[PDB]
Design a binder for this molecule. Structure first.
Ligand code: MN
Ligand code: MN
Ligand code: MN
Ligand code: MN
Ligand code: MN
Ligand code: MN
Lengths: 244, 244
DNA sequence: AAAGAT
DNA sequence: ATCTT
DNA sequence: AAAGAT
DNA sequence: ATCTT
């Protein structure tokens, strides 16, 4: 399927290629920086060709946002199924050590999920799936050699500011947690768990509807959430007692 | 000087080289996407070897932040004079049509300008200069050929998601404006002007003391500033009548 | 965690 | 770190 | 703008 | 878009 082929194409591409710099039309190579600002961008770009290849294979049109900061990174669909679109969003995070618990910021909980056409490429109700392709890497620290340029012949000599990169594809609602991923920018935090948990989908919500009801009614601050709900068991009580 | 060779070197690098993609150790190249998320990352990495080379030519040590979310992109100082540090921060913005007035978000007004050691690599009082390396580029819609990968023999035909990139170096305070650059992330907004004004320094503050005093006493919300000041004029009047 | 930093 | 509305 | 989105 | 305190 599209989904099983995508997952496999992403495991293999990440297995076979290591990004090591940005290159210019004249052949000069600039090394990468070590922060997630930089690597977040590199993994999404790395991902574009793979996603397009699989999506065409499965007869799906791929469309990146035409406008800035409009979700999702990739909208796939068949023209014969206009309201059965698939949203795919890239997310990156780092670990200080290999194999420990990781957590992603999954987008706003006050934009399109509370308003059908806010910050989204196509109205929300036209999407049947929302997939997250998550990347995890182990930070490394940039050396003095990351401040020089290189040519196409010194490629394996460029230092990479990461090691142990892992990638997964899973449904947004499945990996969604119950604590905000950011404050002033109101993002849904994902579960905080090991890589296998994301791949396998050991989440906390019972269904995508519970995922949606919970993030749609989550208050922005802690005083406001204080006596409504702050986590899923309190939300389940809240539901139980008549949403009050 | 360091400053003048750097401005010269940034102008020349930008003229001679055109960033067209990210390359892997194995030689495969992934094209660039069109948002400022991809391009501010690309320009910053592009600027790294340049900054470092001119800094070494002048006897300055170059340090990038060791922690994420810390200003500035580069700290330069001569080992003989550690309390004479220079901050160089890269910023990017875009244009829809060549020229057109541009504006930049220039960092928070509530972190290090308000607390000597907050979100800054070295205490604020050890820096005697804060430069802004600013890039502007005209947006260009990405083509379908952006979704294919390339080899080192096709570098000249990889489509670029930009055109007309210009670069300048200028003191932060000279180009600062008097209106917030962002709301929830409380950034100083730069003046809104044409590229030439940035290069030339046609700002609004009379001095760096006034720039600092203004952004240090700037209130976060419209309602709060309304009893104090929402602009440069109101601020001079405020100053005039005894800071009330 | 929040809440507020790049 | 910077953009949209 | 201001305020709040990626 | 994600991270630090
Ligand atoms: Mn993304
Ligand atoms: Mn919109
Ligand atoms: Mn930076
Ligand atoms: Mn920067
Ligand atoms: Mn403008
Ligand atoms: Mn710190």
């Amino acid at each position: 399927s599209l989904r099983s082929d995508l997952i496999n194409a992403l495991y293999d591409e990440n297995q076979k290629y290591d990004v090591c710099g940005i290159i210019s039309a004249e052949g000069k190579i600039y090394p990468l920086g070590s922060d997630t600002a930089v690597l977040s961008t590199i993994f999404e770009l790395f991902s574009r060709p793979i996603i397009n290849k699989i999506a065409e294979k499965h007869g799906y049109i791929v469309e990146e946002p035409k406008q800035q900061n409009h979700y999702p990174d990739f909208t796939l669909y068949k023209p014969s199924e206009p309201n059965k679109k698939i949203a795919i969003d890239i997310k990156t995070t780092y670990t200080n050590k290999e194999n420990e618990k990781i957590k992603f910021t999954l987008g706003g909980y006050t934009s399109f999920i509370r308003n059908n056409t806010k910050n989204i490429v196509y109205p929300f109700d036209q999407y049947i799936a929302h997939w997250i392709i998550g990347y995890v890497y182990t930070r490394v620290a940039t050396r003095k050699s990351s401040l020089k340029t290189y040519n196409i012949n010194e490629l394996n000599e460029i230092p990479k500011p990461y090691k142990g990169v892992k990638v997964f594809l899973q449904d947004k609602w499945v990996i969604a947690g119950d604590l905000a991923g950011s404050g002033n920018t109101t993002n849904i935090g994902s579960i905080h768990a090991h890589y296998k948990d994301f791949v396998e989908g050991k989440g906390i919500f019972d269904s995508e509807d519970e995922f949606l009801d919970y993030w749609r009614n989550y208050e922005r601050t802690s005083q406001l959430r204080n006596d409504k709900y702050n986590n899923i068991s309190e939300y389940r009580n809240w539901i139980y007692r008549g949403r009050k």
